[PDB]
Design an enzyme around this catalytic site. Structure first.
Site, PDB file in Angstrom:
ATOM      1  N   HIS A  60       1.717  10.944   7.683  1.00 39.48           N
ATOM      2  CA  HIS A  60       2.994  10.624   7.058  1.00 39.48           C
ATOM      3  C   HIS A  60       2.737   9.643   5.895  1.00 39.48           C
ATOM      4  O   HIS A  60       2.305   8.507   6.119  1.00 39.48           O
ATOM      5  CB  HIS A  60       3.939  10.054   8.110  1.00 39.48           C
ATOM      6  CG  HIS A  60       5.307   9.769   7.562  1.00 39.48           C
ATOM      7  ND1 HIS A  60       6.152  10.758   7.099  1.00 39.48           N
ATOM      8  CD2 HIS A  60       5.976   8.606   7.439  1.00 39.48           C
ATOM      9  CE1 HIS A  60       7.284  10.184   6.689  1.00 39.48           C
ATOM     10  NE2 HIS A  60       7.202   8.881   6.880  1.00 39.48           N
ATOM     11  N   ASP A  62       4.471   7.735   2.981  1.00 35.53           N
ATOM     12  CA  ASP A  62       5.717   7.279   2.324  1.00 35.53           C
ATOM     13  C   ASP A  62       5.496   6.996   0.861  1.00 35.53           C
ATOM     14  O   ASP A  62       4.625   6.176   0.548  1.00 35.53           O
ATOM     15  CB  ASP A  62       6.194   6.003   3.009  1.00 35.53           C
ATOM     16  CG  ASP A  62       6.769   6.290   4.370  1.00 35.53           C
ATOM     17  OD1 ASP A  62       7.623   7.135   4.492  1.00 35.53           O
ATOM     18  OD2 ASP A  62       6.282   5.706   5.375  1.00 35.53           O
ATOM     19  N   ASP A 174      10.858  11.782   9.521  1.00 35.60           N
ATOM     20  CA  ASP A 174      11.244  10.373   9.380  1.00 35.60           C
ATOM     21  C   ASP A 174      12.622  10.000   8.841  1.00 35.60           C
ATOM     22  O   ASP A 174      13.000   8.833   9.029  1.00 35.60           O
ATOM     23  CB  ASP A 174      10.161   9.624   8.603  1.00 35.60           C
ATOM     24  CG  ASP A 174      10.020   8.128   8.968  1.00 35.60           C
ATOM     25  OD1 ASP A 174       9.560   7.318   8.109  1.00 35.60           O
ATOM     26  OD2 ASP A 174      10.315   7.742  10.132  1.00 35.60           O
ATOM     27  N   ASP A 311       1.398   7.426  10.445  1.00 36.12           N
ATOM     28  CA  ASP A 311       1.523   6.916   9.053  1.00 36.12           C
ATOM     29  C   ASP A 311       0.168   6.737   8.413  1.00 36.12           C
ATOM     30  O   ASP A 311      -0.731   6.097   8.961  1.00 36.12           O
ATOM     31  CB  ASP A 311       2.250   5.556   9.055  1.00 36.12           C
ATOM     32  CG  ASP A 311       3.708   5.683   9.422  1.00 36.12           C
ATOM     33  OD1 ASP A 311       4.201   6.785   9.719  1.00 36.12           O
ATOM     34  OD2 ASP A 311       4.430   4.671   9.254  1.00 36.12           O
ATOM     35  N   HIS A 441      13.219   8.520   1.742  1.00 39.64           N
ATOM     36  CA  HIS A 441      13.911   7.824   2.823  1.00 39.64           C
ATOM     37  C   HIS A 441      13.576   6.326   2.957  1.00 39.64           C
ATOM     38  O   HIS A 441      14.123   5.697   3.866  1.00 39.64           O
ATOM     39  CB  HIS A 441      13.719   8.586   4.145  1.00 39.64           C
ATOM     40  CG  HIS A 441      12.281   8.693   4.589  1.00 39.64           C
ATOM     41  ND1 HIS A 441      11.472   9.769   4.233  1.00 39.64           N
ATOM     42  CD2 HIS A 441      11.480   7.833   5.279  1.00 39.64           C
ATOM     43  CE1 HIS A 441      10.236   9.557   4.705  1.00 39.64           C
ATOM     44  NE2 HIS A 441      10.213   8.394   5.332  1.00 39.64           N
TER      45      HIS A 441
HETATM   46  O1  LIG Z   1       4.556   0.853  12.986  1.00 41.24           O
HETATM   47  S1  LIG Z   1       5.635   0.446  12.049  1.00 41.24           S
HETATM   48  O2  LIG Z   1       5.259   0.623  10.674  1.00 41.24           O
HETATM   49  O3  LIG Z   1       6.050  -0.935  12.185  1.00 41.24           O
HETATM   50  O4  LIG Z   1       6.809   1.305  12.375  1.00 41.24           O
HETATM   51  C1  LIG Z   1       6.789   2.716  12.891  1.00 41.24           C
HETATM   52  C2  LIG Z   1       6.113   3.092  14.210  1.00 41.24           C
HETATM   53  O5  LIG Z   1       6.077   1.798  14.792  1.00 41.24           O
HETATM   54  C3  LIG Z   1       7.611   3.770  12.056  1.00 41.24           C
HETATM   55  O6  LIG Z   1       7.528   5.148  12.604  1.00 41.24           O
HETATM   56  C4  LIG Z   1       7.232   3.751  10.545  1.00 41.24           C
HETATM   57  S2  LIG Z   1       8.606   4.557   9.640  1.00 41.24           S
HETATM   58  C5  LIG Z   1       7.847   4.654   7.957  1.00 41.24           C
HETATM   59  C6  LIG Z   1       8.972   4.309   6.968  1.00 41.24           C
HETATM   60  O7  LIG Z   1       9.248   5.441   6.111  1.00 41.24           O
HETATM   61  C7  LIG Z   1      10.331   4.028   7.737  1.00 41.24           C
HETATM   62  O8  LIG Z   1      11.071   3.060   6.981  1.00 41.24           O
HETATM   63  C8  LIG Z   1       9.940   3.394   9.009  1.00 41.24           C
HETATM   64  C9  LIG Z   1      11.050   3.067  10.008  1.00 41.24           C
HETATM   65  O9  LIG Z   1      10.547   2.395  11.197  1.00 41.24           O
HETATM   66 ZN   LIG Z   2       8.641   7.496   6.267  1.00 41.79          ZN
END
Ligand SMILES: [O-]S([O-])([O-])O[C@@H](CO)[C@H](O)C[S@+]1C[C@@H](O)[C@H](O)[C@H]1CO
Ligand SMILES: [Zn+2]
Ligand SMILES: *[C@@H]1O[C@H](CO)[C@@H](O)[C@H](O)[C@H]1NC(C)=O
Length: 1014
Positions: A60, A62, A174, A311, A441
């Site tokens: 993924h 972004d 996502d 990610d 997003h």
């Molecule tokens: O690990 S993180 O980056 O803190 O968060 C995740 C899993 O824990 C998320 O799946 C990353 S997603 C990636 C971004 O596009 C979204 O804003 C996020 C909303 O949470």
């Molecule tokens: Zn994302």
């Protein structure tokens, strides 16, 4: 044409009905925390019926979030793509899917030719597969459908040109909740399948219990089902590896081989992955196959999708190796142990869907039908993601401004073929790509870090400048005698004048037209109308004298009104918010009448005294302790008074009454009718002092909103023949109600300042007996019925308001149209409310790592339409959709696609013409030419122009139809040689049209046509 009003579709799952029946209890389900302990019969799969498992590697990426697009590209994505190319090239059995074409195009163009050829080969052979193929994976809540289509087309056009592929399966893992506008656009763009992930945990549980996670998703008004698109909803809490192999993350985490230590990752369930060996493969396979068979119980076929990614994964060569080799040892064991009755392999998304449909055609499964949306999302407990419907509202408004500028630039320049030296295609590609990027997003959603938001803003500012350049060059060419036209493609023949962006009080960006007896007596201005019908709209310009009159190019006088230029100041000495008038700049306002998709020229001329056809507004400042307000040459002196209720009426329009605080209190539609109570009020929500805190994503209010304490605000009343208004300086908001003869326009200049942990809401209070029903739009495309549910918390009852919302009873409706996407609701019968801005000191635990403390002044715009609806033919009580009236739809168009205004920059325009487009058909009011785009550069012998035509559906309320001409877009340009209906991206021809005529479309339908010209 299908009737979109009177026939309630019969579907297996209708989301509004499901919501009414569901209990939404958040019970601990065991290892599947939001589900139950899944059981399966080991005998279900056997030698003659195996479970086919497709493990689909993904990453993924972004396009901006915690880093900018370019920072992520340099630090992560270019390495992921370089190593994917090497690893897939060297391991023929490995697969990988890719979604974000903005990154792929950024990478591919920097590759040497040898590697470009290697890349094309792994795509052509099926190892690397593009999913969706849009520039980004867009937000689905705040995005306008036109921009969702723009970004899809930008990515797919690139893929067709460079990779020779067009994806037919979509991957959206996502976006924070999902909209039916996606299958609408995708099904009209050649797609056959789509996948979604972020839906409310209670919805996943409910649908999983009924094996309704795969469904044919049709539009809410589609009785026949021709809009249906097969959709796969993932079942679990995340798209990461711990939540994609099966129900127990403590087990699935042990199959993410990047979590053993050297990569800096670990399993929070405290059991790490272990390298697969001949001594542990049987026990490790026992565990993994058990997770797979539990996941398979939630679906209807014997084909199982197992995503394998997270990610920015697959970055290091060592990571590719550790995932691939360990999974290959597992496949070799599993596939050779007949007792498992499983055949597992790496696959792509399309391979999964092709196998599912093979099973369906063999009669092994039938799928349910579904309509509705998947808002508002909650990933756990009461954490509803309704904050991002408002976060970073300045940029949400900017999105809508650039949306219109891109449409107008593409349309104005499409009329001609341009030499390459004019750089038209170059500027339009830049504008389309920056606006497309912002659909991400973490872009329009307002969920990126501060410096990333700044990057998106700078990119959009450059895109606006590119559109201006293209628009003004096009206007000069369209309105100058051809034998006189002498372009310098770098010169500014006209400057755009925009009265609402950035907006008065936001940026002093508008130029004043400087006239004077000793410098310049007159100035030409031009208006453009991108809509395909004749349109009148009042327009205003700043001028350096109040003694100005307006004429058309036949020298016919045009009635005009001059008003002062008022600017509001938060006075730090007197501690009041009050207006100051200019003594050298004035506003001139007049009605412009412009042809369909055309242009109209007017002239502003100075005189030494009051002109015969120009009137002057009166001005009244209501406040205690007033001081003088000189206005230079302005001919009417400002009046003063103590605060008091006031009433105004422009033309034969409604009469509006205002409280002594300058806020609307009633609307009287006609001379005799009742003064209907309609009151504006501003309130504030706070944040919880214990428990979870609101942030960029989450709205977690500490109870119902509290009224903003208004004090004794200063109220300015301007009364004119063409335009009147009431403006009041409230804490954090200069609120303005403008009247031009029809439904009022509302403008709020919102500056939340340093008010931490505050969300400012604008509420309308009426006595309309709406109960628990209200309507909000989805992506500017359709209105969906909402039901307020008191079994859910306040924040769950907030929905996106991308372009409008309404409440109604049997007799009366109140519709609020918006010029920017914001969050809103109806929390009690008779009310509407919409959030203006929010400033939050805390992070909300979704990975952003900051609050929202970068607020800046924004000018929000609206139209407020109160109407009688007792005579309207409306859907029945069980229909899930609603529809606007003609007046409400025209009001929305006035916000989203206003007339464009151009001011000639030099002193004399030689060869000027008065109008363009007078012979263009004026189409029925429900039809729009959403897109007009020339698809060929000037060297193409056969030119091609693409059109996207959209017809909305307006209620029938008793107004006779009248006029209008048929619009055939294929004959808008001369010498037509062919007309074809195409997919919405223009990439595939679907029908060769008889007589080169493009038929108009049915209500709620959208079609695309390409005309070819010799
Ligand atoms: O690990 S993180 O980056 O803190 O968060 C995740 C899993 O824990 C998320 O799946 C990353 S997603 C990636 C971004 O596009 C979204 O804003 C996020 C909303 O949470
Ligand atoms: Zn994302
Ligand atoms: C593009 O793909 C098609 C099949 O989809 C193939 O026939 C064609 O040769 C490829 N390249 C061309 C000619 O554009």
């Amino acid at each position: 044409c299908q009737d979109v009003v009177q026939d309630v579709p019969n579907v297996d799952v209708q989301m509004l009905e499901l919501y009414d029946r569901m209990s939404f209890k958040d019970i601990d389900g065991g290892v599947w925390k939001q589900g139950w302990n899944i059981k399966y019969d080991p005998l279900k799969y056997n030698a003659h019926h195996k479970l086919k498992v497709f493990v689909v590697p993904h990453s993924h990426n972004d396009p901006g979030w915690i880093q900018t697009f370019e920072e992520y590209y340099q630090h992560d994505t270019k390495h992921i793509l370089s190593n994917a190319l090497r690893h897939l090239h060297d391991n023929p059995e490995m697969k990988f899917i890719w979604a974000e074409i903005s990154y792929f195009a950024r990478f591919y163009h920097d590759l040497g030719e040898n590697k470009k050829l290697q890349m094309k080969s792994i795509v052509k052979n099926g190892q690397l597969e593009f999913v969706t193929g849009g520039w980004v994976m867009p937000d689905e809540a705040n995005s306008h459908w036109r921009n969702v289509l723009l970004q899809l087309t930008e990515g797919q056009t690139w893929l067709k040109q460079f990779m020779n592929v067009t994806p037919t399966a979509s991957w959206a893992i996502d976006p924070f909740g999902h909209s039916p506008t996606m299958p609408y656009i995708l099904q009209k763009s050649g797609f056959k399948n789509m996948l979604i992930q972020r839906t409310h945990y209670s919805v996943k549980k409910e649908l999983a219990q009924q094996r309704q996670l795969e469904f044919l998703w049709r539009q809410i008004w589609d009785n026949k089902g021709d809009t249906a698109l097969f959709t796969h909803m993932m079942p679990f809490y995340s798209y990461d590896i711990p939540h994609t192999c099966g129900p127990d993350p403590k087990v699935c985490c042990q199959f993410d081989f990047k979590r053993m230590g050297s990569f800096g990752l670990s399993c929070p369930w405290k059991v790490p992955p272990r390298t697969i060996s001949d001594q542990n493969v049987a026990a490790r396979s026992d565990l993994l196959v058990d997770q797979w068979k539990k996941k398979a119980e939630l679906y209807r076929t014997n084909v199982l999708l197992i995503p394998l990614g997270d990610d920015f994964r697959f970055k290091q060569n060592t990571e590719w190796d550790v995932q691939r080799v360990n999974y290959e040892r597992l496949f070799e064991h599993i596939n050779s142990q007949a007792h498992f009755n499983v055949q597992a392999q790496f696959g792509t998304l399309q391979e999964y869907f092709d196998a599912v449909h093979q099973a369906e055609r063999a009669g092994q499964a039938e799928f349910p039908t579904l309509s509705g949306d998947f808002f508002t999302y909650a990933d756990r407990s009461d954490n509803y993601w309704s904050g991002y419907y408002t976060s970073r509202p300045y940029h949400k408004r900017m999105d809508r401004v650039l949306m219109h500028y891109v449409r107008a630039a593409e349309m104005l320049s499409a009329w001609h073929s341009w030499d390459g030296m004019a750089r038209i295609e170059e500027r339009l590609e830049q504008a389309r790509r920056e606006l497309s990027l912002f659909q991400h997003h973490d872009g329009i959603t307002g969920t990126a870090k501060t410096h990333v938001v700044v990057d998106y803003e700078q990119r959009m500012q450059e895109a606006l400048k590119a559109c201006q350049m293209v628009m003004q060059q096009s206007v000069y060419r369209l309105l100058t005698k051809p034998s006189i036209y002498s372009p310098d493609f770098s010169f500014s023949y006209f400057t755009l004048d925009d009265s609402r962006w950035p907006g008065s009080g936001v940026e002093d960006s508008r130029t004043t037209i400087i006239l004077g007896e000793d410098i310049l007596p007159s100035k030409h201005v031009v208006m453009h109308n991108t809509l395909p019908h004749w349109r009148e709209q009042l327009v205003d310009f700043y001028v350096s004298s109040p003694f100005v009159s307006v004429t058309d190019l036949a020298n016919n006088p045009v009635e005009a009104q001059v008003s002062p230029v008022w600017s509001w100041h938060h006075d730090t000495l007197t501690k009041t918010i009050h207006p100051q008038g200019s003594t050298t700049k004035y506003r001139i306002i007049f009605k412009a009448r412009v042809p369909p998709m055309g242009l109209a020229t007017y002239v502003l001329t100075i005189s030494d005294s009051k002109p015969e056809h120009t009137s002057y507004a009166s001005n009244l400042l209501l406040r205690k302790n007033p001081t003088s307000l000189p206005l230079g040459q302005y001919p009417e002196d400002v009046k003063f008074g103590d605060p008091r209720e006031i009433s105004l009426r422009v033309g034969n329009g409604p009469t509006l009454a205002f409280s002594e605080q300058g806020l609307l209190k009633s609307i009287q539609l006609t001379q005799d009718s009742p003064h209907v109570p309609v009151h504006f009020k501003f309130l504030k929500y706070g944040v919880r002092s214990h428990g979870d805190r609101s942030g960029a994503y989450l709205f977690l209010p500490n109870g119902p909103a509290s009224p903003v304490e208004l004090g004794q605000p200063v109220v300015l009343v301007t009364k004119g023949k063409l335009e009147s208004s009431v403006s009041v300086g409230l804490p954090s908001v200069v609120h303005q109600t403008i009247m031009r003869g029809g439904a009022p326009e509302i403008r709020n200049l919102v500056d939340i300042g340093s008010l931490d942990n505050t969300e400012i809401v604008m509420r309308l209070e009426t006595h309309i007996d709406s109960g628990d029903i209200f309507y909000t739009d989805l992506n500017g495309l359709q209105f969906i019925k909402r039901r307020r549910l008191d079994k859910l918390p306040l924040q769950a009852n907030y929905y996106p308001i991308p372009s409008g919302m309404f409440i109604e009873d049997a007799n009366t409706r109140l519709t609020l149209l918006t010029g920017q996407p914001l969050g809103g609701s109806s929390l009690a019968s008779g009310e509407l409310e919409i959030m203006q801005d929010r400033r939050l000191a805390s992070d909300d635990e979704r990975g952003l790592g900051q609050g929202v403390l970068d607020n800046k002044p924004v000018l929000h715009i609206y139209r407020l339409v109160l109407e009688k609806v007792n005579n309207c033919v409306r859907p029945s009580k069980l229909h899930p959709a609603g529809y606007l009236t003609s007046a409400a739809h025209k009001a929305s168009q006035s916000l989203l696609d206003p007339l464009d205004k151009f001011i000639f920059a030099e002193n004399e325009w030689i060869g000027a013409q008065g109008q363009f487009g007078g012979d263009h058909p004026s189409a029925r009011e429900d039809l729009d030419v959403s897109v007009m785009r020339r698809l060929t550069k000037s060297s193409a012998k056969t030119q091609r122009v693409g059109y996207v035509l959209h017809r909305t559906n307006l209620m029938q309320c008793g107004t006779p139809e009248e006029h209008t001409q048929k619009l055939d877009v294929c004959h808008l340009l001369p010498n037509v040689a062919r007309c074809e209906r195409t997919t919405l991206t223009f990439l595939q021809n679907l029908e060769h049209l008889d007589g080169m005529v493009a038929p108009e479309v049915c209500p709620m339908e959208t079609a695309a046509y390409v005309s070819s010209h010799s």
